[PDB]
Write a protein that binds this ligand. Sequence first.
Ligand code: HEM
Ligand code: HEM
Lengths: 370, 680, 680
Amino acid sequence: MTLNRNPMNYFAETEQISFQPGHIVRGVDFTEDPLLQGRLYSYLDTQLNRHRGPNFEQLPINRPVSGVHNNHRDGQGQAWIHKNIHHYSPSYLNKGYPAQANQTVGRGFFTTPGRTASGVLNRELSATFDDHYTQPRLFFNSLTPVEQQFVINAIRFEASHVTNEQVKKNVLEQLNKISNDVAKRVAVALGLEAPQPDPTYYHNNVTRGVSIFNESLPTIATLRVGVLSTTKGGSLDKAKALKEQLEKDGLKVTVIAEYLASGVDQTYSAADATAFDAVVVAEGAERVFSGKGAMSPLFPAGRPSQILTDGYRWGKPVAAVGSAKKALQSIGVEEKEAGVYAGAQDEVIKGVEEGLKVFKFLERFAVDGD
Amino acid sequence: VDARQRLKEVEVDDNGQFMTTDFGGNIEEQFSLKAGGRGSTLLEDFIFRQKLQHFDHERIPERVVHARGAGAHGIFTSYGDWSNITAASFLGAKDKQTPVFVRFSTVAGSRGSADTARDVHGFATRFYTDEGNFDIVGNNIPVFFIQDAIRFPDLIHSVKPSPDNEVPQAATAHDSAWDFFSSQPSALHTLFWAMSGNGIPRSYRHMDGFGIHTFRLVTEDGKSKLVKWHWKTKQGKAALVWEEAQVLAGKNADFHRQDLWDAIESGNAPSWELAVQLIDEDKAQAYGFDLLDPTKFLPEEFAPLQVLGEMTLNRNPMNYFAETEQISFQPGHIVRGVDFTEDPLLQGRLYSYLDTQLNRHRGPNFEQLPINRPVSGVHNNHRDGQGQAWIHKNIHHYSPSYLNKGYPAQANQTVGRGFFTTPGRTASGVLNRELSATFDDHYTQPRLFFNSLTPVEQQFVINAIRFEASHVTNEQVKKNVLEQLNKISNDVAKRVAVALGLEAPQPDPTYYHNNVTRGVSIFNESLPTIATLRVGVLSTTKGGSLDKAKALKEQLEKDGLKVTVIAEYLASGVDQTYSAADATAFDAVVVAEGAERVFSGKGAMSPLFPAGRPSQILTDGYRWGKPVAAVGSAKKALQSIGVEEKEAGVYAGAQDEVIKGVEEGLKVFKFLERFAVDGD
Amino acid sequence: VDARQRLKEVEVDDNGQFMTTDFGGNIEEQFSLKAGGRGSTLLEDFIFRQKLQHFDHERIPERVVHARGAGAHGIFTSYGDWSNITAASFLGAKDKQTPVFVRFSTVAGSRGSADTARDVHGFATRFYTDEGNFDIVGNNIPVFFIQDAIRFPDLIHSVKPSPDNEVPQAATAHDSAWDFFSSQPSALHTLFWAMSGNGIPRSYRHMDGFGIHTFRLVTEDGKSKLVKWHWKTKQGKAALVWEEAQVLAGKNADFHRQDLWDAIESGNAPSWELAVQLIDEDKAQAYGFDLLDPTKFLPEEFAPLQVLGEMTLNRNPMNYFAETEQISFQPGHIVRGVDFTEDPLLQGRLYSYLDTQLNRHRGPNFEQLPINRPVSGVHNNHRDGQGQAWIHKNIHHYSPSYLNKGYPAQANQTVGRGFFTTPGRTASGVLNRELSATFDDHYTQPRLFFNSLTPVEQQFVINAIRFEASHVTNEQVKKNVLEQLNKISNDVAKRVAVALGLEAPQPDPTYYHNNVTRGVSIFNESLPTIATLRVGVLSTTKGGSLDKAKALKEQLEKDGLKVTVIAEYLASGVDQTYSAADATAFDAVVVAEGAERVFSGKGAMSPLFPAGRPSQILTDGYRWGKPVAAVGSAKKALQSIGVEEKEAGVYAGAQDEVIKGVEEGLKVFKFLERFAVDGD
Ligand code: HEM
Ligand code: HEM
């Protein structure tokens, strides 16, 4: 599936749309997943709240393309007028229409015939559901070492915000049942002590496709490069030429400067590293990285220096064009490094576009033990 | 021409189709999904829940007033080019046609009440003009109970059932209503109209209509005249009698709505002529009252009616809910060429009607409903809202803007044919929560109404007040009514007080007078046509009565009447049974020949109908003022109940003689000689 | 003990107080704020808008079914400690008292319809127990139209008015309803109950009540028995006649709701005994039908009723809307000691009643409403919602938590006295959208019902079907009805087909039988008490009749009766006028001495009442099976219409002789000799 159209009104289309798992057709059926079973009730019921009426599938974005024929009448905000005045089944007076459809006639929906119900009526869950630790380990084991650090570092950040000491202890108990290393590593940040190992659910099994960074992107199209430049000297024209070249590969390039000159897409005040997939300093733009240049009324002090610092420290491809290397060495970044490119314009582009395929450079993040 | 042409886009035909969910896909909805043979129903049965949920949410709130009603589609044709008085598009050219919808109602009952309860009646018309919807929301009575809109809750709370037990339904015959009438003497004028024939019309098609308020007509230059809206029925004014109305309320609660349905369906579309009164702005207080007073009407001797057009109701709704129930009238649905006045009652209505739609429709987008949509087109900066059916292309939904290029543009008096308030209008004085002293004359006009009614009609009004005030359990309130009634007429206070077992206070000549005006009476005139009126032909399955009756029916139908042939059971020519029959459903009764057999002896006692049924239909019909008839030997039926052929409205003889007598009598409709008047 | 004790905290007294806005502050709200005396109303008049806004939004949706109804507060007292059969707290100790609320209704009419329309009636009871609210939501008829809940919209859509015109109101006498009954033969059983006296009860206090569904009673150990709920009226079963009900629907739409109000207000609180049938779980298919079939009832010869208690309705509501209108019953309001069964109809109801409250109340917090609140206390993790009336102290609104320390706690069979499904219950088989073949006998039990009625009662059912099926305009549907009727009884098919003018189909003896069961009849038993019943004493203001009439009244009232003294006008002893009087309002009519003057001559023609009024009241009253009487010379009145004192139910003579006679006649209530039976 390819998404080629934008909404015309956000509210009418995006906001008012009502998804349900119970929106099912012939050739599909549910299973006895206790989570799924409840969703079927919930999604239909909650529309009464959002839409204030039972006629929310009469809304243009909820209308089917297949046609609606039944004996449902009235309702709040009824948009249709119904021709059939015999709105009940079975009737002599409607002459059998709307007709009843099933497996054999009318291509109607049907539950799977092989399905059965066996046992006592219970408010319980199957014992096959009681292994809560094996698959999270399976997931963790299947992650690259840096990605593993991210998950642990994420838990360190999150569980740090918990103000109840005992709850944090309770987290460690559950974390420990999965992996002691994780329990050890987290307990450092929380300033607590790792419990004794539990070999019950521990294992080293692995499966594929659960990782994000370890593979390279199929395409770098639409990704954004930010060209840090300046309004005075020769930086702008070089930058403009850099722009057209980059767009051809599929990228979207934003030319940043002190103010909105001829080729300037964005200002330094309105720019930040988060808006870009890669940052590249144009040549002669070094003037704004130190001295009076870094302190202008046109932007907060240290802004260009921060964007470069931010972009590098966040794992993004960083670049300098020719003489621009002083900017990268202003913050302590050597061109020899991985994900950092300095040299001629064509040399840098080729490096950057390759880097975008890498997308994120995990060498720039510290891993436990060291 | 099909007045419902715009509504075609939303008509859904389920014929030849399979059952579907509301989101599409073919289904069967006659069995629930169970776990095992005799098992429990499964929560994963999406088909069940989707079906029941729509049923569970089928109900919307009924109207706060005028809950019980019915409606139809039609066309309004203008008689001229009225730009000399108004800039309105739909009155702007001769032969110009506008689609309309009209809804008739009763004010105090709920959705299930009887059409034939004594009440004020509603007459709300919408004009789907090409300059926007314009609504004349009015009643069948030219005056209202109160002079300030802020008193509407107080009035309505009183007339509606008591908050403790919710008794009584659709009636003013209780203490709270007559407490209000006495405590707020402004209500007395409309009270009298309610107690007249207007309180019990024969049909929606047999009542006049009124805008009640004084409005304004404005021309493109901005010149204005005060106006009053009228609807005069081309079928004539007719009313029932209270003793009849009560029985009819049981045998057919849907009497009025069915009659309107049948008339339209049978090609006999009802029609009204739209008339107005034009008054100069300086003559607002000229005619003995303030024209911003809604408890007063302007006699036609002071200002004759000039008709501008005629409206005909020729189409019925396809779905009652989608069309009749969901429609939302507002007095604030106004267009260029019309404007409001400083009527304290009208001003409040403008707020109320718009606000109350939020309650009934649960959203601000109720004019997107097919029956509320105009034919003229809607362009503005209104966005979002609950149940928004449209998608708006303009993403610059504010004015003034550079980016939308000035569109949608601003229209006014000079440009865009836009609405404008009358330029001559002014505001002068202190800000006050008071009413003008021109509004305090509450007794003069009810007398004028009473004086202008035929002697029998006056008795009806008194007979109504006697019945109603009898149900009041508090003696002092009844004393208060006599005090207020006496200020109108000493005769009325005297005559009513007999029933209440009280004595009328000594006369007050302060407001007494003998003036008279036209058009306020119902019975004194004869109907223009007898078309659609119904005759019930009492016959029998024994002998040759049925064949004779069949010949009687076809003859009557050719003249335009609707005939029901009643007998013991549904034989070849029999339309209805005696069990299913009652006098209230018919405008005239005629006993066919040989039908005397069921009025006496074994014939009057069959298991096929309750005892005395044929005799009751004739007895009720005669005692209720209807034309009665017997054919040939059928005369025995008339003396079975004590009715002599010599009388008025009674016809006996050969069929040709009988048909003619009945049809002549139906024009009279009701024979007022058969009712006793006070004294005598 | 006043069941509305909990409701005291939310009662508002406006006595002795000044007017206020809804947000506080003292005001005057009778004049709008205007610009310049006879100016326009100002938008800055907050007092006007706040007052009108509440008025405009006063309406809430009426119930999707059972819209027309009335209710009262009461107390339920247990007769014993029923832990042997159920773990229910409200049945757990002898002489134990539980507050209740009961609402009686009709199924097909809207909020304004008549109480005396032919319909199934509702009998819904809430038990405000100390273990949560428990609701028995039931009818006055032990059987239902359909066997699956997914077919409920189809049934209701058919019986309710036609979607094109909304005709007819509160009636099954149209093509769509009888189309359904014939096409869905499951509906036939309840159809017969509807056409019997059950379709037109005398009062709410004169009908039995049924849970209809089979439920389960569970003990603390978890042992279960299948159960059926019964309410047996301690006032006796009584019904009207159709010809009476129709006239009554017009003269008093509020007949049932007023009667319940007056009874409680007069110290005569109605009472019912709560009875049950206990069936072993293994005996579900034992008695000739499936006990999960709601189109079946279980004869008392197979399982007699055992009474567990008595409930009495001794309190009236203070506000109808807040209490009666807003109350929300659900079969899913269940407690420990009760459980559901795999009745396909009951299963669906559980979804519907909860879901539909979202529509009527516009929110999920409707059990926060005072009349829906339990007396047992509510503690859970439900938060937010529209119109949330509570503030929650616990900021840990999730259940598996350390921080709330496990509260609110989880309760079950063993701990916390919590609810539990019956432990023996199982599910076996394929997942199916079909119904059991044990459900396929639609004709045997209606035959059983018909056979168990007195010959006149049998005629009534037939007379109702003749009337109803007469209104069907499609001949083929009537043919279809005869086919289904024939499968039950050939005689019924024969007798009905006469009225329809059709031919009786040839007999089908497949389902024919002569079996009989008890308790399903209304007339064959006499009323336990004549208390609360109403007698209308027709008198006159002329002569000594009034004093004579007054003396009769004083005598009657001690026995429990309610007497209305009728005359030309409201004299010293006069309760009601002749204009305001009708036979439908009385259980018995008795002419006082000297009242003969108004039954003939000038007396019968007065301006104070419609002509023939006193004569009709006697005529109607006699013809409707009621006890009729004359005192002394009053015999002149009875022979005016052809009624000899020699007859049954008619009493003439001395006052003392008459009194004893009427009171005797009232126990019989209705005299069935006065109605003709087929063949004769
Ligand atoms: C001469 C005075 C009045 C006339 C002629 C009149 C007429 C009517 C009519 C015909 C309707 C029925 C509309 C329909 O059929 O859909 C109606 C409803 C209504 N009226 Fe009045 N009325 C009057 C007084 C008032 C006043 C003074 C107020 C408020 C201050 C008011 C508020 C309302 C409201 C809120 C509705 C409900 C409309 C809806 O739910 O669609 N009325 N009126
Ligand atoms: C044996 C079968 C049934 C019985 C005894 C029954 C009885 C009743 C009664 C007495 C009421 C009145 C509630 C009140 O007085 O406040 C009611 C209302 C209602 N019933 Fe039924 N009914 C039955 C069948 C059904 C079925 C099969 C459904 C749905 C599948 C249903 C859905 C409803 C709904 C939605 C209401 C409206 C209640 C409200 O709006 O608060 N009923 N019923």
